[PDB]
């Protein structure tokens, strides 16, 4: 099972007083004169449980509280009482057990399970509690346990599954006894200590104001496209403004733009009827979508459109804005066309003569300042950008930090996010090259954006863990083998695991680091195979390799 339990062999506080209620409580108490009464739980000290002479009153109200001795009211040394309280999903659950003892001033060593006693469906946040009246308090954490049911369904024994190596072994082999051998239980990975960010030290902001707060937008058949590069791209300005009618990003999350780093960035500007605004979307059809501006089916960018009634209308309606409306072919995506040939409708060539069987391929707008919003002018901007893993010339606002070497860290060089250990390189980059790569197409070297030096990258160490044991029939002692690591890098219940992290019994083999075994100079027949010509056994008593 995997649930909230009291970890084995731990401190219980020993009262003989407001207390917290982190996740659960193991309360216990031994007495002879029933000097203890009950409990008060809640937040701003809320429910109450008391037991005077005979009847036990369990009531939830709001009260007035130094105690001594309404949504529900379920009213109704020799001894040791054990209780477990927890609060899950609006229910409050109480388990309990009684037992006779003859012992003083200390908890007995024994095993006994706790049958459930009650569930009450209150639904109140609880973070503190207090007793009412020698009593012991513990706490519950998420753990894994192995429980043993006998013939009649009573739990008679259990194994904590993270106390020490032997317990982990007994978990993987779902059994309570272990035969002599070597077993492979878990993996071991070093963990990053810090974080590093390195961006170039330019400060000029990108010129979004020019594009957005412009003067005269171009007509749709000839849309102006401006490249943006070599500038910090802060989007908070576009964030604050609330006068937008559409702000939608396709290949990215619109609220993460301040963190990315883009390779190539283009801004397209123009002005359209409101009714045709829907036509700015991949895969759509229409006259705009087929004759004036086509978006690809794998688009990656943002579309930002808003209304411009109070800026783009003449007294009788502005007529400057124009659009193609008669073309012999559809537009492939991102294709501009500003030819001025009369569209032939009949079977006689126009020869520059409009009229019969000949129409001009363009048509203008009338922006009367009193039309419906379906006809008022709309200013639209399209940001399209490519988002490889690359030098990424365009980068958002972010603060650079220092450089750290020879430690498993977590780095980001201009969007080259990763983790590993950075050392100094003996490689010879060429003045145009930005980073290296291995046979399997793995990044393994970078160039510092701010000092232009070459750093090698190696992954942080990791491996498997195995447990050497003579059979539990013989002893309870074990040794541990960390596969293919260097004994320096080995650093967990401190009274149990930390013993297998340090000591005078560290041995370094060709197969890993061996801890808990003593390296003799003799030679015997192989008993337990470690590897590379090294065996291990149990002799005179301890474990030898």
């Amino acid at each position, epitope marked *: 099972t995997q649930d909230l339990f009291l970890p084995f062999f731990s401190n219980v506080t020993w009262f003989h007083p407001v207390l917290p209620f982190n996740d659960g409580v193991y309360f216990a108490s031994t007495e002879k004169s029933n000097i203890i009464r009950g409990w008060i739980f809640g937040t701003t000290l809320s429910l109450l449980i008391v037991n005077n002479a005979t009847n036990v009153v369990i009531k939830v109200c709001e009260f007035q509280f130094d105690p001594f001795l309404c949504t529900f009211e379920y009213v109704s040394f020799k001894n040791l009482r054990e209780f477990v309280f927890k609060n899950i999903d609006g229910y409050f659950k109480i388990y309990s057990k009684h037992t006779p003892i003859n012992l003083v001033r200390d908890l007995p060593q024994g095993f006994s399970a706790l049958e459930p006693l009650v569930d009450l469906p209150i639904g109140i946040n609880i973070t503190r509690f207090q007793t009412l009246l020698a009593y012991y308090v513990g706490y519950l954490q998420p753990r894994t346990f192995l429980l043993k049911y006998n013939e009649n369904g009573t739990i008679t024994d259990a194994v904590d599954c993270a106390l020490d190596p032997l317990s982990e072994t007994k978990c993987t082999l779902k059994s309570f006894t272990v035969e002599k051998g070597i077993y492979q239980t878990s993996n071991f990975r070093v963990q990053p200590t810090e974080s590093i960010v390195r961006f170039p030290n330019i400060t000029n902001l990108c010129p979004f104001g020019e594009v957005f707060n412009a003067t005269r937008f171009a007509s749709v058949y000839a849309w102006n496209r401006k490249r943006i590069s070599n500038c910090v791209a802060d989007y908070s300005v576009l964030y604050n403004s609330a006068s937008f*009618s559409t702000f939608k990003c396709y290949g990215v*999350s*619109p609220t993460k733009l301040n963190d990315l780093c883009f390779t190539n960035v283009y801004a397209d500007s123009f002005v359209i009827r409101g009714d045709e*605004v829907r036509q700015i979307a991949p895969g759509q059809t229409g006259k705009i979508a087929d004759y004036n501006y086509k978006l690809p089916d794998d688009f990656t960018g943002c579309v930002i*459109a808003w*209304n411009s009634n*109070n800026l783009d209308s003449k007294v009788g309606g502005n007529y400057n804005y124009l659009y193609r409306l008669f073309r012999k072919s559809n537009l492939k995506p991102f294709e501009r066309d500003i030819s001025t040939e009369i569209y032939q409708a009949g079977s006689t060539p126009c020869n520059g003569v409009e009229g019969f069987n000949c129409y001009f391929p363009l048509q203008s707008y009338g922006f009367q300042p009193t039309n*419906g*919003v379906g006809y008022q002018p*709309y200013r639209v901007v399209v940001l399209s950008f490519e988002l490889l893993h690359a030098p990424a010339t365009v980068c958002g606002p972010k603060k650079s930090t220092n450089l750290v070497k020879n430690k498993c860290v977590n780095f980001n060089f201009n969007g080259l996010t990763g983790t590993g250990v950075l050392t100094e390189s003996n490689k010879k980059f060429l003045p145009f090259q930005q980073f290296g790569r291995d046979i399997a197409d793995t990044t393994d070297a970078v160039r510092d954006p701010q000092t232009l030096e070459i750093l090698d990258i190696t992954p942080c160490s990791f491996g498997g863990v195995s447990v050497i044991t003579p059979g539990t029939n013989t002893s309870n002692q074990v040794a541990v083998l960390y596969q293919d690591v260097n004994c320096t890098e080995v650093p967990q219940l401190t009274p149990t695991w930390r013993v297998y992290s340090t000591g005078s019994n560290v041995f370094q083999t060709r197969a890993g680091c061996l801890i808990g075994a003593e390296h003799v100079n003799n030679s015997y027949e192989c008993d337990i195979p470690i590897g590379a010509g090294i065996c291990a056994s149990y002799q005179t008593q301890s474990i030898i390799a």
Partner: nanobody
Amino acid sequence: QVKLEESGGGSVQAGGSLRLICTAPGLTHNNCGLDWYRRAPGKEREFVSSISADGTTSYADSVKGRFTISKDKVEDTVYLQMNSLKPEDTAIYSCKTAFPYFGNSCVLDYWGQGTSVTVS
């Protein structure tokens, strides 16, 4: 600086019929819900109808049966068909829609002007 509109009202006799079209241009991208409210003289505004992005329609007690709220597939146009009208339907109706601000596109709520539905 108005992102919404109300349209489709008019004066029709009792038992008549009419068509309402609340037209916003960027509703397809926003994917927010739409509400019709009404205000008749001598009282306060009341809920008329509601449509979600998935078409789960909800109607007022008085208008259900002939007032049908619907949404077109394209062009971001909605309808509220009215039939079986009665003279007390003469009121001012209004829309309400949501718009983008800091990324997500439904935070800013916005009521249009409203249109006069005058039944005789």
